[PDB]
Design an enzyme around this catalytic site. Structure first.
Site, mmCIF file in Angstrom:
data_model
loop_
_atom_site.group_PDB
_atom_site.id
_atom_site.type_symbol
_atom_site.label_atom_id
_atom_site.label_comp_id
_atom_site.label_asym_id
_atom_site.label_seq_id
_atom_site.Cartn_x
_atom_site.Cartn_y
_atom_site.Cartn_z
ATOM 1 N N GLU A 11 -32.227 -21.065 21.107
ATOM 2 C CA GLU A 11 -32.862 -20.255 22.115
ATOM 3 C C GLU A 11 -32.792 -20.829 23.511
ATOM 4 O O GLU A 11 -32.907 -20.098 24.468
ATOM 5 C CB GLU A 11 -34.355 -20.102 21.781
ATOM 6 C CG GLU A 11 -34.540 -19.359 20.465
ATOM 7 C CD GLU A 11 -34.303 -17.868 20.515
ATOM 8 O OE1 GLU A 11 -34.330 -17.194 19.533
ATOM 9 O OE2 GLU A 11 -34.092 -17.357 21.691
ATOM 10 N N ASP A 20 -33.337 -11.786 28.102
ATOM 11 C CA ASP A 20 -32.670 -12.234 26.923
ATOM 12 C C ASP A 20 -31.329 -11.505 26.740
ATOM 13 O O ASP A 20 -30.941 -10.665 27.541
ATOM 14 C CB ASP A 20 -33.639 -12.155 25.735
ATOM 15 C CG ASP A 20 -33.864 -10.800 25.078
ATOM 16 O OD1 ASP A 20 -34.588 -10.621 24.128
ATOM 17 O OD2 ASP A 20 -33.160 -9.842 25.561
ATOM 18 N N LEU A 32 -40.507 -13.673 23.607
ATOM 19 C CA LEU A 32 -40.389 -12.328 24.155
ATOM 20 C C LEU A 32 -41.670 -11.834 24.841
ATOM 21 O O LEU A 32 -42.778 -11.944 24.319
ATOM 22 C CB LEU A 32 -39.938 -11.317 23.131
ATOM 23 C CG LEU A 32 -40.079 -9.907 23.708
ATOM 24 C CD1 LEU A 32 -38.888 -9.592 24.605
ATOM 25 C CD2 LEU A 32 -40.092 -8.894 22.579
ATOM 26 N N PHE A 104 -38.014 -15.381 13.574
ATOM 27 C CA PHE A 104 -38.410 -15.654 14.932
ATOM 28 C C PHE A 104 -37.587 -14.766 15.909
ATOM 29 O O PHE A 104 -38.056 -14.259 16.884
ATOM 30 C CB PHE A 104 -38.017 -17.113 15.132
ATOM 31 C CG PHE A 104 -38.357 -17.574 16.496
ATOM 32 C CD1 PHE A 104 -37.475 -17.455 17.578
ATOM 33 C CD2 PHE A 104 -39.579 -18.219 16.696
ATOM 34 C CE1 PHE A 104 -37.832 -17.984 18.819
ATOM 35 C CE2 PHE A 104 -39.938 -18.750 17.913
ATOM 36 C CZ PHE A 104 -39.068 -18.582 19.005
ATOM 37 N N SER A 117 -29.055 -8.425 1.351
ATOM 38 C CA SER A 117 -28.845 -9.837 1.627
ATOM 39 C C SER A 117 -29.990 -10.644 1.029
ATOM 40 O O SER A 117 -29.785 -11.763 0.592
ATOM 41 C CB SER A 117 -28.890 -10.147 3.104
ATOM 42 O OG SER A 117 -27.839 -9.523 3.808
ATOM 43 N N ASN A 132 -22.359 -10.562 3.310
ATOM 44 C CA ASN A 132 -23.176 -9.355 3.595
ATOM 45 C C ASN A 132 -23.937 -9.495 4.913
ATOM 46 O O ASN A 132 -24.110 -8.543 5.666
ATOM 47 C CB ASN A 132 -24.245 -9.142 2.474
ATOM 48 C CG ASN A 132 -24.997 -7.830 2.616
ATOM 49 O OD1 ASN A 132 -26.159 -7.739 3.100
ATOM 50 N ND2 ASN A 132 -24.294 -6.784 2.218
#
Length: 164
Positions: A11, A20, A32, A104, A117, A132
């Site tokens: 990040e 972002d 965020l 996250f 998945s 996948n």
């Protein structure tokens, strides 16, 4: 390597409001603020989150504090979710970090949508799940980060980050 170092690599750290990859207003370590187009909405959310008038800028300490909250909320969220909990329970420690990383970035709801998945990871079909997971908007939008996570699920080691 641990969850915090892993997410800090993916990040980044920014002390001023930024946009972002999706164009939303963010601060610190991927915190965020709002999906709203308004820098003002963003700055308001920011002061609410910090408890001070920040005028778009925070300290390193404030960034880490938000980061500590976010990681905690991600873990508690997985543990409270009927779809994610069982997957989390089934995994080894490293792979657990990989799922935390996804939650996250994309939220509980978003990861809970990777039905097939999740099933493959739970079954420990490593290679199939990696293939996948790559068939997603997620992978197409942020391929280098998606690759790192996917490799983590694939191998069960921190190789993808040992570089970085």
């Amino acid at each position: 390597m641990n969850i915090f170092e892993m997410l800090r690599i993916d990040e980044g750290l920014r002390l001023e409001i930024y946009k972002d990859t999706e164009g939303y207003y963010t601060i610190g370590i991927g915190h965020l603020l709002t999906k709203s187009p308004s820098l003002n909405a963003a700055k308001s959310e920011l002061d609410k989150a910090i408890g001070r008038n920040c005028n778009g800028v925070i300290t390193k300490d404030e960034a880490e504090k938000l980061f500590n909250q976010d990681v905690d909320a991600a873990v508690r969220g997985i543990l409270r979710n009927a779809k994610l909990k069982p997957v989390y329970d089934s995994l080894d420690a490293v792979r657990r970090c990989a799922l935390i990383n996804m939650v996250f970035q994309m939220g509980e709801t978003g990861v809970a949508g990777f039905t097939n998945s999740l099933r493959m990871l739970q079954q420990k079909r490593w290679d199939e799940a990696a293939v996948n997971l790559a068939k997603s908007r997620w992978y197409n939008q942020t391929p280098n980060r998606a690759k790192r996570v996917i490799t983590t699920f694939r191998t069960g080691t921190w190789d993808a980050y040992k570089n970085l």
